[PDB]
């Protein structure tokens, strides 16, 4: 078989794609779709192989048949010895952001406020902080909690995209793909940044990568960590250095899905891909580089140090894990088992 198809979210993924189809030799070719959905669409027609997925869209595309087979590992202390491939995974951690000057501002008294979420059915950005929000408030409103927020994937008329810009010329509007401007951890973190929302659904590492000259993209060229504060669950507000110790909950690693029965083929091929292309690769500083696309995190996330195997050969539940999984249930009793397409 040898050949792997990969689908790529919005226009400015397909370009990326295509200059590693191109350096691949077509040995992984393009597919291009303008939401998640259609991508997990896609791999099941079979018209896609693979594609890497947070796990909001893994519960999706678990429940359509689809199955996890490599997921991002980023550099750690703990587990040094042994290699990147066949290191486990440590997870992200979902956090939930506001600024420094904003005071009095705590998990009590964010009803009414403005909102920043990566993207509707996604881990940090919507899944954890909204089925919290549910649990306290005792009633699925999730639509009228905040007075107005950007959430990628929600009806563009409606309030949840009120605070989305849309692309350079203002088209596409909430659209859950790059194109947004509020779109991802870098969108949702920039829209908190340019004080448009109050607070920011994100994960641990998206603060450090944008702050202290670390992106040196215009808008975050000037931003200190010193800045910012994170809201914890017992409405305390630490600083970003005190992650471990507040954070909204501690999420499975973005993982590349495909059809059960294509698993093994797009294992191999990514494998080899990552031995040319991957953080010290035959070809990566020179010719390209897999997991770099400056701060935009196109196709994978910018701090991938490697794709790991997985090892125990788990499932999307057992991947996903329980707690997680019963969460995105019952916040799901709000919008019944099968595929939703
Ligand atoms: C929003 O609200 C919902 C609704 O409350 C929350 O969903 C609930 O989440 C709970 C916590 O994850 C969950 O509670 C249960 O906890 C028990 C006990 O956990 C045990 O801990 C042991 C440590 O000593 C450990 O060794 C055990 O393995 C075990 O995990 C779990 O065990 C039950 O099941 C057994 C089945 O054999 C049973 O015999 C036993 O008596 C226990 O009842 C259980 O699996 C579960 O984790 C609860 O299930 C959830 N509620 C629902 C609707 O199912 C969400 O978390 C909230 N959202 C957010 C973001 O917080
Ligand atoms: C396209 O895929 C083929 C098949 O894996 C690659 O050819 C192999 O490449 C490896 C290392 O790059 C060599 O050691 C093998 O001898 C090659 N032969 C095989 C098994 O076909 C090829 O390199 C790939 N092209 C790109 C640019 O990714
Ligand atoms: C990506 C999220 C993740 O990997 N979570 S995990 O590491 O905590 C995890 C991985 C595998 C299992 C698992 C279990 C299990 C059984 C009893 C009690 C707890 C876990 N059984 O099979 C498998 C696979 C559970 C959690
Ligand atoms: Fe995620
Ligand atoms: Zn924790
Ligand atoms: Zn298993």
Not at 125 to 149: H, K, R, Y
Not at 161 to 183: F, I, M, R
Not at 305 to 325: F, Q
Request: net charge neutral.
């Amino acid at each position: 078989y040898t050949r792997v198809v990969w689908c790529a979210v919005g226009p400015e993924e397909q370009k990326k794609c295509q200059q590693w189809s191109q350096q691949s030799g077509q040995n992984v070719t393009c597919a291009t779709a303008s939401t998640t959905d259609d991508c997990i669409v896609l791999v099941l027609k079979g018209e896609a192989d693979a594609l890497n997925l947070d796990g909001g869209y893994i519960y999706t595309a678990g429940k359509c048949g689809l199955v996890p087979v490599l997921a991002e590992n980023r550099k750690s202390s703990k587990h040094s010895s042994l290699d990147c491939v066949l290191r486990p995974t440590e997870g992200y951690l979902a956090v939930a952001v506001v600024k420094k000057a904003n005071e009095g501002l705590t998990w009590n008294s964010l009803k009414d406020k403005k909102s920043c979420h990566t993207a509707v059915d996604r881990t940090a950005g919507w899944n954890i902080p909204m089925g919290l929000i549910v649990n306290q408030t005792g009633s699925c409103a999730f639509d009228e909690f905040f007075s107005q927020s950007c959430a990628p994937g929600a009806d563009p008329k409606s309030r949840l995209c009120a605070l989305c810009a849309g692309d350079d010329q203002g088209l596409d509007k909430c659209v859950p793909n790059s194109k947004e401007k509020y779109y991802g951890y870098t969108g949702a973190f920039r829209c908190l940044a340019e004080d448009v929302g109050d607070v920011a659904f994100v994960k641990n590492d998206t603060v450090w990568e944008n702050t202290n000259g670390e992106s040196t993209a215009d808008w975050a060229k000037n931003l200190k960590r010193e800045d910012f504060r994170l809201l914890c669950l017992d409405g305390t507000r630490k600083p970003v250095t005190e992650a471990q110790s507040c954070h909204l909950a501690v999420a499975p690693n973005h993982a590349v899905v495909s059809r059960s029965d294509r698993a093994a083929h797009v294992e191999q091929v990514l494998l080899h891909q990552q031995a040319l292309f991957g953080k010290n690769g035959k070809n990566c500083p020179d010719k390209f580089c897999l997991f770099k696309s400056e701060t935009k995190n196109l196709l994978f996330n910018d701090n991938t140090e490697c794709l790991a195997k997985l090892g125990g050969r788990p499932t999307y539940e057992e991947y996903l894990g329980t707690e997680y999984v019963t969460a995105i249930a019952n916040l799901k009793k709000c919008s019944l088992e099968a595929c939703a397409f």
